[PDB]
Design a protein around this ligand. Sequence first.
Ligand SMILES: O=P(O)(O)OC[C@H]1O[C@](O)(COP(=O)(O)O)[C@@H](O)[C@@H]1O
Ligand SMILES: O=P(O)(O)OC[C@H]1O[C@](O)(COP(=O)(O)O)[C@@H](O)[C@@H]1O
Ligand SMILES: O=P(O)(O)OC[C@H]1O[C@](O)(COP(=O)(O)O)[C@@H](O)[C@@H]1O
Ligand SMILES: O=P(O)(O)OC[C@H]1O[C@](O)(COP(=O)(O)O)[C@@H](O)[C@@H]1O
Ligand SMILES: [K+]
Ligand SMILES: [K+]
Ligand SMILES: [K+]
Ligand SMILES: [K+]
Ligand SMILES: [Mg+2]
Ligand SMILES: [Mg+2]
Ligand SMILES: [Mg+2]
Ligand SMILES: [Mg+2]
Ligand code: NA
Ligand code: NA
Ligand code: NA
Lengths: 436, 425, 423, 427
Amino acid sequence: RADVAQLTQELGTAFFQQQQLPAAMADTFLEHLCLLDIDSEPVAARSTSIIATIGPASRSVERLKEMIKAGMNIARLNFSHGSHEYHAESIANVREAVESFAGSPLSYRPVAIALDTKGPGSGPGLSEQDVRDLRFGVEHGVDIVFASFVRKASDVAAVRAALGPEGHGIKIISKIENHEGVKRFDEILEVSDGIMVARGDLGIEIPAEKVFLAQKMMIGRCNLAGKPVVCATQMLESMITKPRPTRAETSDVANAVLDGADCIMLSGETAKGNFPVEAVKMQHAIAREAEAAVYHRQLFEELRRAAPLSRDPTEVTAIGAVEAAFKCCAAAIIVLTTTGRSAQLLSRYRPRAAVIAVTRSAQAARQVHLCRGVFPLLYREPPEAIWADDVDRRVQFGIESGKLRGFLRVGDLVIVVTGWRPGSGYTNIMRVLSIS
Amino acid sequence: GTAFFQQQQLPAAMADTFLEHLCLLDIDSEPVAARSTSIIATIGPASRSVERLKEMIKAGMNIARLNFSHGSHEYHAESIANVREAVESFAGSPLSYRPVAIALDTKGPGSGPGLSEQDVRDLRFGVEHGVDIVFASFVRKASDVAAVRAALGPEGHGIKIISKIENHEGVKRFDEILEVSDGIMVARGDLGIEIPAEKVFLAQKMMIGRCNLAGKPVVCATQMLESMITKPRPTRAETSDVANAVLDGADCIMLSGETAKGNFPVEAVKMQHAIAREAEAAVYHRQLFEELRRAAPLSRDPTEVTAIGAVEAAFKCCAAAIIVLTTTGRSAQLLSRYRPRAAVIAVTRSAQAARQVHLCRGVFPLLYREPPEAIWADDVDRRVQFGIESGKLRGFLRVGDLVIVVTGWRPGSGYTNIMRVLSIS
Amino acid sequence: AFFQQQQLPAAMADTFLEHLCLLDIDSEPVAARSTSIIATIGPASRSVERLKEMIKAGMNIARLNFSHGSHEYHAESIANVREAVESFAGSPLSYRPVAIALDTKGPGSGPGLSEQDVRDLRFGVEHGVDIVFASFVRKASDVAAVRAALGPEGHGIKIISKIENHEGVKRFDEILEVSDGIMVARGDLGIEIPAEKVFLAQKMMIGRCNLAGKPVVCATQMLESMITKPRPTRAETSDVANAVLDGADCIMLSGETAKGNFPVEAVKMQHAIAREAEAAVYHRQLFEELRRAAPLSRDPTEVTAIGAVEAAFKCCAAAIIVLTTTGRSAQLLSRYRPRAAVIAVTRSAQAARQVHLCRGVFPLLYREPPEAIWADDVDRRVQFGIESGKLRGFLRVGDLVIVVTGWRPGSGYTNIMRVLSIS
Amino acid sequence: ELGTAFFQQQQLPAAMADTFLEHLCLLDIDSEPVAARSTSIIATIGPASRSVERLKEMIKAGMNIARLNFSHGSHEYHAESIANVREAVESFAGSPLSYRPVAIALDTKGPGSGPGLSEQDVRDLRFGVEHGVDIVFASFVRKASDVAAVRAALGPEGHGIKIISKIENHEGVKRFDEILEVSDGIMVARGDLGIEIPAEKVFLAQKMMIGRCNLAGKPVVCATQMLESMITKPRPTRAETSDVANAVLDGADCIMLSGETAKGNFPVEAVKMQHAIAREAEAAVYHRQLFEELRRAAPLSRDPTEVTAIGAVEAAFKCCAAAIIVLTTTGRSAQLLSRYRPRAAVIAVTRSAQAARQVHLCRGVFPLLYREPPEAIWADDVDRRVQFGIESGKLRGFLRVGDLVIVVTGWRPGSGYTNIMRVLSIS
Ligand SMILES: O=P(O)(O)OC[C@H]1O[C@](O)(COP(=O)(O)O)[C@@H](O)[C@@H]1O
Ligand SMILES: O=P(O)(O)OC[C@H]1O[C@](O)(COP(=O)(O)O)[C@@H](O)[C@@H]1O
Ligand SMILES: O=P(O)(O)OC[C@H]1O[C@](O)(COP(=O)(O)O)[C@@H](O)[C@@H]1O
Ligand SMILES: O=P(O)(O)OC[C@H]1O[C@](O)(COP(=O)(O)O)[C@@H](O)[C@@H]1O
Ligand SMILES: [K+]
Ligand SMILES: [K+]
Ligand SMILES: [K+]
Ligand SMILES: [K+]
Ligand SMILES: [Mg+2]
Ligand SMILES: [Mg+2]
Ligand SMILES: [Mg+2]
Ligand SMILES: [Mg+2]
Ligand code: NA
Ligand code: NA
Ligand code: NA
């Protein structure tokens, strides 16, 4: 207790009874489980992003507005079904629903658009349909590609080549769907931006009883590499027909978050099901509960022990900022980022504190949804004449959005992460600030 | 030789952190050990046939659950007769005979504040028909367990009482309930309606952790393979749920509609068996054993002291099994609480203890039928040899394997105090 | 080559046992010596010429034992120490501050702070001593009497309570609470309690001081045989190494420097052993345990300190440069025992002297002209830390350093940590 | 059932701590040691400690191993020292409470230069075999071939003599692994080591060698200048008491006295001081981390003696066992228990007088020489030896009725079959 006694006197016992903080303070994983409390309410914003597949049940602008409000962060377009005209209309509807909230930039929630490819089929690699669909993606400015049936590093290179010179900024998330993809995982992760554990095909390609081993291994390896990992397929399957999920489905969603997944996905549940909005709301409710149940004490210790020494100032600042956030129970870590990289490096240490990422790049704001606990804020103001004042205005924008979004209150401590000069790659500063 | 350290997730077992353990999990590393998490199958119209029950026993069913929320006493007496006929059909080959427990799951208190009159009648029927376990519905406080125990009367003292936690009050009063119960059931069906659905996993993980700390059996129940009531293969969420219940530390996993009324009762049992085997090999024993040891208090009880020594010895040599002689099952339960990787082969003359020890993870009961040898030390050795011969026939043991043998210094329950390292010949 | 030195193979070990197995006599220490050396000034070490050699050998704190000698004698010792210290002031990038500590005679027959101690404490204030080593502290009220005897002009003097008997050990927690630090005074402790129990008292007190983040001094008979012999015994080198491994902030020399035949050699020996022992510290366990035990805090200096030490370990930072007025920001970094040297840039001459009490804090006294813009003044003090660090061998071009500063002037506002590449 | 007082003695509050830092913070000068002293004391025999009367006082003070330094004195001088040690030891053979085996160790002059074993070392090693010494402390061992030369010189009759390799220079430290592999144990010979390598590096060599020996399960001796000032002064310095305590905390199986007992004015007081400090330091060992690390670092084993030893040590910790009674012919089963550093005393019952003397090299092993004729029924002979261990334990203060003990035996007679651990209640 002496390690939390002064902070308990200052913040109160009510603060320390919420968000599974009694379980967080435990000295062993066993004691942590024993202290999990159904009466300990989650307080933090939901950190695991929700990917919802867009289809006939979730295509209308009106329905998409409800889905964004329910918690959808990434809209998935499954190119296994529908024409280019159909998907272009889905993209337009998503963009219309997203831009309907651009009224106030303080609450504007960016939504990424992901293109999920049909796949190689009987072919040994990049199909002609995938080449056409990937070209459509670049032309329509998609943020992410979920590349189907990635079996080796050369499959990812073929996807990158098909995106051409104009699609260099698009994130490639390799879908691991068969035995070869699992066995060649390391070479695939090395050349990918992230991974999707595509359990539908994986569960038919390898014995169904082995899928959890592949899922846990891939999530662990992605967490170690600091690259986003998506858990997908049949997470809330029964909700395609019923308004409430089974006990196995709620458990699966909670366990994907506890495993370390950055994102969780909905397929038939939102694309064609009877309750698309309810499915998004259910993933949101479970992820909030499960994130608070993460045993950060061991996770942070293990991420530090396993991660190699780094001479990169962004990485060095990120670990210092996460350590500082844990020391004071910081409400948030506000970070300025051009590409999303500084926010991704904070996310890899899994802080309890929300990572509020302030960026001018609309694409980076959408793409950072791939990183757990990163809350993107799109800054729209033109640059100030003095650079230091432009940095300060962006930090204040993060604070004001954080106050109005519920993340921050007067009296809270926040960690602010910035760099010494303009441009990407120069993050090197960490500040402890009292919110006024 | 060399292939041995490739199997049963041994590369992941040797890892220095839980994160690296996860990174080393291999879909090609085949499980070798026998499946340690017991399977409880609910009996109903889909699974009452004596011939279908024989297939369920072969598939891996260890405990037959009788749900007294449906059917009369006449119905449940027929279910018991059918289970006993199917189980006893294998008694002609003692080396492969698998005991099967019979559990009575009560209707519950309804709108009442405690033990119902129907529950009193059902509990007496349970004693009269010799059931091994009671799964007491809606246990909300310690007095509910005392009322169940009193309704079982003087003749039902040996029946195990597994308290079902199904509502907010049961979760909040968990410690006082566990203290007076033989074990717990995380009854997720009612729990998921009584508390928010998104909070059930917290209740399940807490209860399993607390039962593991207390060394008392814990059952994970309801909708684990729900889609298998009508489909031949489960969903990805269902296989994950079964695997995670085992990784959480559940001693038993259960099937309800999947075996009582569904079209795939045998396949549901086979699926739980296949998943549990994979998940048990994926347990990070290095941390689990260390934490169970650190949390367990010092003990002056020789059975408890021998059990921790035997489990430590089994991990040191990668023992294929710990062979234990037991009258009540207690010596096997105390070995099970330290979660050894080695199968705990429990040799007993008590048909009831043989059935009840299925509640304890990794305990493989063998019912010894022979009358005692005149020389007690020779009778103990004959039982150890029966454990070895059964283990060999069932694939648990081979010549060259090391086994830990746990026995006592005198006849009768409560005197376990010896651990021996034996090479299988 | 980098990873072969300063016991880095042993530092990477997964257990304390494997760390011991990987210790290498060929792995040379590269970091500057972090444990301060306290040398007792007496007939063998009073000359200005001798004191210059002692400062060069590694003496950081000059102890005046008021159990012997008059006020006139000690005033002359103080003047000689100050003359020797100030003779190196011509090179500001290499100047080493040296603290002056007054070790009291003690209560004797007990009851009441001695009238001799009242006079000696007033002498200390008048002569501007940095530290008081208060003899035979048995309870919190003894520290209060020492503080009261220092008066209004002595508020800034650090009180290091000497634990010398059973009562002091038993009432340790209440003593530490009101003291700036502790001295494990093994001479009297070894006569007051059984000789074979002193190591238990030493290890307990060092552990509790490390937990509290307060300085702890190991003292007496560390290199005893060096009073008459040019080389110490095997037990003496082991004792010095083990005091550093136990977690002592300072190590002391008494008769070895006050009256011995080899005072300079004794200082050189403590310096050589301490540097080897500091590299042999198993930081992986020490940092984790200190981090887990240090309470959660909303004080920005405490929050910045742990973030800075974590960042330093992540990049193998050559140093943590910190700006400090009172020494507090450097003390809060020192409590986490970084491998990186804590270079404390200060304008206060007294704070520069007193921070030698905290392990791994290298004080630099800032004497460069002031800048008109506060932001430029801070930057120049940071560049001074870099320049002094380069000259002294702490830093080289290409090294990474962690820089710790505040958002406004004055003490108590440290809240910034920056990762900086040298040149 | 143990009482409250039980958990306050032998640093049990510090033993229960969750971190090493918390363990240090909980060390208590008022928490009295209760266990018997486990670190053996080696005393060098010389003019100050040669008389039968002085040796009797040294045995009473705690001397377990008598060291004969063949760097000085003739074969006739050392034969008289050996006879005096044996006379002093056998003078207690009447009283079971006072009789204790004492090993005799021959410390060689060394190679000086040359390319192999010196002619003097060959003759001195032959003298050792002829006079039935238990241990050889081989001076200036630099490589594995130096150990093989000592092993060869122990002739056809002395293959059972333990070779403790003395590491005294840079080459010995650098070639440590190959030396330890072929040796029975190691001596950290700090006198020469402190002249051969920089004085400030000796502690690194000491801690490294003790750690590697602990990992290998082989005895390690800390030697030279431990209580140096006691050659002329009746009490040691603060650095000397610290050095003894830290050698025990480092993991040394034995501690040594050289000039302190060979020529000093206070030989008996030096032995008493080492006994007093070792008892305090053994209780201060952080067993929770030590056992966990020894467990994690030691490889998996299919040797039943090793498997039984770890099970027995785990069981001893679980019940706070007063002792682990082990039957051993060569000492190996006691050595394998000792490597896991139990807090419980390891009472080793043996018929071998040589094994009884030699097991003093292993920390926490209390040898009991058994001389009853063998029973016709082997199980009866085993039971009689187990009860001999219990009754000796009761007489010596290790055990009382109601205590729990762990008993380690094998399934058949002869060395190499240890495979049984039992939990017994003392009646
Ligand atoms: O995370 P990224 O892509 O490296 O961006 C971080 C960069 O953002 C900043 O904080 C602000 O940069 P800009 O003013 O160019 O937007 C830089 O100081 C820092 O290098
Ligand atoms: O586990 P339990 O019920 O305590 O039974 C263990 C008992 O079994 C035995 O091994 C054999 O006893 P029996 O010969 O009476 O079957 C005893 O020595 C021991 O006390
Ligand atoms: O360690 P201390 O005593 O709190 O001093 C730290 C202070 O030093 C500074 O870095 C510089 O302050 P000054 O300009 O007054 O010297 C402050 O920003 C900070 O509050
Ligand atoms: O430690 P060692 O030399 O292997 O001796 C252990 C041996 O002692 C015994 O316990 C008793 O053997 P003996 O009857 O031959 O003395 C054996 O069962 C065991 O193999
Ligand atoms: K697809
Ligand atoms: K029921
Ligand atoms: K004094
Ligand atoms: K010699
Ligand atoms: Mg697919
Ligand atoms: Mg129910
Ligand atoms: Mg004194
Ligand atoms: Mg020598
Ligand atoms: Na996110
Ligand atoms: Na089972
Ligand atoms: Na000993």
